[PDB]
XYZ file of N, CA and C in Angstrom:
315
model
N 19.713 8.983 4.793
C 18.580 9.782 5.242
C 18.601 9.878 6.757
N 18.663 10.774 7.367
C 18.215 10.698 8.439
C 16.591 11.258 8.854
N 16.530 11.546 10.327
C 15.271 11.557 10.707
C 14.407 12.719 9.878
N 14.970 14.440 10.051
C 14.347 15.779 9.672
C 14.218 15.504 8.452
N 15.323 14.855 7.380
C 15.087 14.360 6.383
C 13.628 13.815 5.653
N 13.351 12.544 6.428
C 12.404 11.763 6.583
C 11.042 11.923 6.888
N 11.731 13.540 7.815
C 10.271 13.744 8.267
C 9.334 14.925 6.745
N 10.467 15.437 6.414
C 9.705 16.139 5.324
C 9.525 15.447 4.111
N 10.311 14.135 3.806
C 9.414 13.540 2.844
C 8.104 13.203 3.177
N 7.803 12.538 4.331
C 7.088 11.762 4.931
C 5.791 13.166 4.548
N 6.000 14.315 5.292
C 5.066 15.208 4.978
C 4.725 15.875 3.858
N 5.706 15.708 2.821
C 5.121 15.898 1.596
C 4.024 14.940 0.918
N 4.497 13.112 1.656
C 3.173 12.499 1.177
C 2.017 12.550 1.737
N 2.529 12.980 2.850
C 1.030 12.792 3.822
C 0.098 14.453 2.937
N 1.106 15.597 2.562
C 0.310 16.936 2.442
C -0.334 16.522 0.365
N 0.508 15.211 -0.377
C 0.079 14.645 -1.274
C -1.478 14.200 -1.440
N -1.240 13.043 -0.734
C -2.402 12.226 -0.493
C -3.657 13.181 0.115
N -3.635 14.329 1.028
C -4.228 14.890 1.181
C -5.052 15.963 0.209
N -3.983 16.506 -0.625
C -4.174 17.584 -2.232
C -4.643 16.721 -2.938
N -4.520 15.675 -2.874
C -5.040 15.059 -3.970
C -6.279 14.266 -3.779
N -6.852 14.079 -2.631
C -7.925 13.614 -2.436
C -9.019 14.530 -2.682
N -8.450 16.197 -2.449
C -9.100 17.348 -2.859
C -9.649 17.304 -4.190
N -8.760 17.367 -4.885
C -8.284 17.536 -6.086
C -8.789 16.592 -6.910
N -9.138 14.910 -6.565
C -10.204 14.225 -7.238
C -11.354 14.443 -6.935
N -11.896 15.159 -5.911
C -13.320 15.348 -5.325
C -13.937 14.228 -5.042
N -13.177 13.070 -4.810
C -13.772 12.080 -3.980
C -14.325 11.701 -2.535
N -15.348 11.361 -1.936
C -15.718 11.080 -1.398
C -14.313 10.549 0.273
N -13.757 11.124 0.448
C -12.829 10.393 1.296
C -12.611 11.348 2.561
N -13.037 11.114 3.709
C -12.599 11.746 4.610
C -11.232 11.735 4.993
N -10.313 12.570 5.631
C -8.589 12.200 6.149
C -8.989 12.819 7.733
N -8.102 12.474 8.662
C -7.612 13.171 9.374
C -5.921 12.437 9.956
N -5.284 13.633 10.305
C -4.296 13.400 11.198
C -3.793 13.456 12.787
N -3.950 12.142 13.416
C -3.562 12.119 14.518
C -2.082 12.072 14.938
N -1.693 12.919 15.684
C -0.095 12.534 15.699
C 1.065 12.074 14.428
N 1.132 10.587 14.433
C 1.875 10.066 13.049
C 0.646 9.899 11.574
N -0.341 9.402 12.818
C -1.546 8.589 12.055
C -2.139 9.235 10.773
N -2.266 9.074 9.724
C -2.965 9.149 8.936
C -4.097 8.170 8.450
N -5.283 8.769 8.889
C -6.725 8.084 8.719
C -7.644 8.251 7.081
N -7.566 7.470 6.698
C -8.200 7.929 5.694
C -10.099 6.540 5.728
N -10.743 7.570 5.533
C -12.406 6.844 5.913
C -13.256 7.044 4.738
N -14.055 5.950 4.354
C -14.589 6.193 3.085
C -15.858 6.039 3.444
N -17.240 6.367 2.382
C -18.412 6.348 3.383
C -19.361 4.808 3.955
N -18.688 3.761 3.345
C -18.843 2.385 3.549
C -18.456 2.345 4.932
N -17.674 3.380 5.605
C -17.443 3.387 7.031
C -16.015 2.339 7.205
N -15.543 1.570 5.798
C -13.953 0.905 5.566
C -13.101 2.202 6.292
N -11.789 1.891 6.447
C -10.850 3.173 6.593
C -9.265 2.156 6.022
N -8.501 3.198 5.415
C -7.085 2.940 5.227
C -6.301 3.280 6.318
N -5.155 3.364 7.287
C -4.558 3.687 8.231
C -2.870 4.200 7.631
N -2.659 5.171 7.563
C -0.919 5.853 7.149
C -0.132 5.538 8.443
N 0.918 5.164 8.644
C 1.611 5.235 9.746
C 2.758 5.700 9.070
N 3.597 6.625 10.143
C 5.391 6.942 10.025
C 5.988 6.438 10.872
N 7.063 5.930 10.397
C 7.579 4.882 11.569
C 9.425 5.402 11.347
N 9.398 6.842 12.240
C 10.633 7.816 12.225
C 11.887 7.130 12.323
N 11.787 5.730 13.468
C 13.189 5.512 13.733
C 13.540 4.306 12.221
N 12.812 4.312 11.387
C 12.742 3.153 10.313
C 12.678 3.483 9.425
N 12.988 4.855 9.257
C 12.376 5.468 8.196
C 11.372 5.129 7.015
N 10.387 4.825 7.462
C 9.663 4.128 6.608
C 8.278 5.008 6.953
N 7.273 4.580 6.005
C 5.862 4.399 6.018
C 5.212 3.033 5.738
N 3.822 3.429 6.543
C 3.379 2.235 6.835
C 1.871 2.528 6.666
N 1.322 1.428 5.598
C -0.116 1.252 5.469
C -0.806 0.272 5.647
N -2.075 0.407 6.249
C -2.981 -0.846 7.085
C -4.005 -0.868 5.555
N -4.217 -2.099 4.854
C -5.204 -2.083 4.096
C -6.433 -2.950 5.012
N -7.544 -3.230 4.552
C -8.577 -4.297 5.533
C -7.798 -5.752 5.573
N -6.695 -5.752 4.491
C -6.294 -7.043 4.525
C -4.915 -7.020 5.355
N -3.690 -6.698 4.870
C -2.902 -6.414 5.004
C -1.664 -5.626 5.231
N -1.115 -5.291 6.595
C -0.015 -3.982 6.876
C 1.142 -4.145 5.593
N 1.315 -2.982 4.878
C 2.550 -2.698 4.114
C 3.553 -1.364 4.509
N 4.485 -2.090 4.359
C 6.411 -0.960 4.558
C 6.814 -0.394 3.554
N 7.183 0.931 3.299
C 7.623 1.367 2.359
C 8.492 2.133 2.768
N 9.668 1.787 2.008
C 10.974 2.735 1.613
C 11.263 3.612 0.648
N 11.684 4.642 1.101
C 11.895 5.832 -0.022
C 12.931 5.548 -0.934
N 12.900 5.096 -2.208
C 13.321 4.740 -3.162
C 12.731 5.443 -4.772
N 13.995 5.513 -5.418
C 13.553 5.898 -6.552
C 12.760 7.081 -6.556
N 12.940 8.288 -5.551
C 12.314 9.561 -5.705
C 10.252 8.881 -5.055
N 10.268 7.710 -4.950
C 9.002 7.123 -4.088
C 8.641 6.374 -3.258
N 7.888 5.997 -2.589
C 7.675 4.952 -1.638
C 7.791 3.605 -2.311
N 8.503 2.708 -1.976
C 8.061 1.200 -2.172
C 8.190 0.486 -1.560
N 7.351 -0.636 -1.273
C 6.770 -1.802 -0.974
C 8.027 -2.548 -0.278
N 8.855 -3.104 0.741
C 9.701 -3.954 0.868
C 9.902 -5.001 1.385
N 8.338 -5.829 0.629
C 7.804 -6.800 0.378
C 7.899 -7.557 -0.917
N 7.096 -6.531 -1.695
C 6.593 -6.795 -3.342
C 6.745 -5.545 -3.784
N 7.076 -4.452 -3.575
C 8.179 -3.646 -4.720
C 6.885 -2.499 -4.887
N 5.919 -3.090 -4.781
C 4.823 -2.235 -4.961
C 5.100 -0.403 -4.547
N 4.465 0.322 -5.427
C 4.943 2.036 -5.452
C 3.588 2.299 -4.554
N 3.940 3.356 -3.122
C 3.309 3.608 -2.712
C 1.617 4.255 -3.243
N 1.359 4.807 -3.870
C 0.929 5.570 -4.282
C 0.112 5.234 -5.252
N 0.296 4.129 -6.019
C -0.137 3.096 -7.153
C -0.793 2.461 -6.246
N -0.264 1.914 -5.397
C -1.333 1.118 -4.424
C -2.014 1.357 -3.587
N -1.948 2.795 -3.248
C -3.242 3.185 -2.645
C -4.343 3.798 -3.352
N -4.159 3.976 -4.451
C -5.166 4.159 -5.438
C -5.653 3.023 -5.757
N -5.271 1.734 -5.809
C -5.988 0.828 -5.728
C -6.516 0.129 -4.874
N -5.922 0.718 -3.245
C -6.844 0.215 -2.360
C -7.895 1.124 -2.184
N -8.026 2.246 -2.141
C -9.346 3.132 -2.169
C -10.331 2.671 -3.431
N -10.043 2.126 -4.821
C -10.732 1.431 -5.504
C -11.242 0.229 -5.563
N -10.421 -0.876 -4.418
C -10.657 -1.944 -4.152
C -11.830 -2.256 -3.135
N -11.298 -1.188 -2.239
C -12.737 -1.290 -0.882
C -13.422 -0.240 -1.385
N -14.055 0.445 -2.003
C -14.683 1.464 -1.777
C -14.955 1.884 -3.394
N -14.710 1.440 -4.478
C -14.935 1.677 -5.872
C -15.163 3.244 -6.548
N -14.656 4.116 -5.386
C -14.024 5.352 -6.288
C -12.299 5.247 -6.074
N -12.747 6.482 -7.335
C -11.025 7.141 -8.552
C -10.501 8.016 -7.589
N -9.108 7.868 -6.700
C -7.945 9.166 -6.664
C -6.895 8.591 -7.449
N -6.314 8.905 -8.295
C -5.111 8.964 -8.976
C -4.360 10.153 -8.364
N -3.262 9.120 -7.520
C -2.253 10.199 -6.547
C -0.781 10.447 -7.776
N -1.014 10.068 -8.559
C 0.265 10.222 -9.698
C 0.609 11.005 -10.503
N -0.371 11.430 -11.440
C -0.316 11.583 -12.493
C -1.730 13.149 -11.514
């Protein structure tokens, strides 16, 4: 993979997570700063997206813990605990904040 590569996966999840926050009609504000992807719920919690170009990776701030993900298997995962991007941010928006986006399915 290189970078242009990277960068349009990277923006297909970021233009994902975005359609699909639509698309559940949940309660979730986004915006994009630069790399940043902000996501704010009305508890005033927020999730944080980072792209991290020269690493090709993404990167998410939960209230607890920063996670790395590598594009694998056609998805993001975890290269920590294996965890699928996308699975787990549906459960961190359910964890802090107790509404449904299902970014998957």
């Amino acid at each position: 993979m290189n970078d242009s590569e990277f960068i349009q996966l990277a923006d297909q999840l970021y233009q994902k997570i975005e359609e699909k926050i639509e698309e559940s009609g949940a309660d979730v504000d986004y915006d994009q700063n630069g790399s940043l992807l902000t996501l704010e719920f009305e508890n005033h919690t927020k999730l944080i997206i980072n792209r991290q170009q020269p690493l090709h990776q993404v990167w998410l701030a939960t209230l607890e813990n920063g996670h790395h993900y590598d594009y694998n298997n056609g998805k993001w995962i975890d290269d920590r605990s294996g965890d699928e991007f996308l699975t787990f941010l549906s459960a961190a928006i359910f964890k802090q904040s107790k509404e449904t986006v299902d970014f998957t399915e």
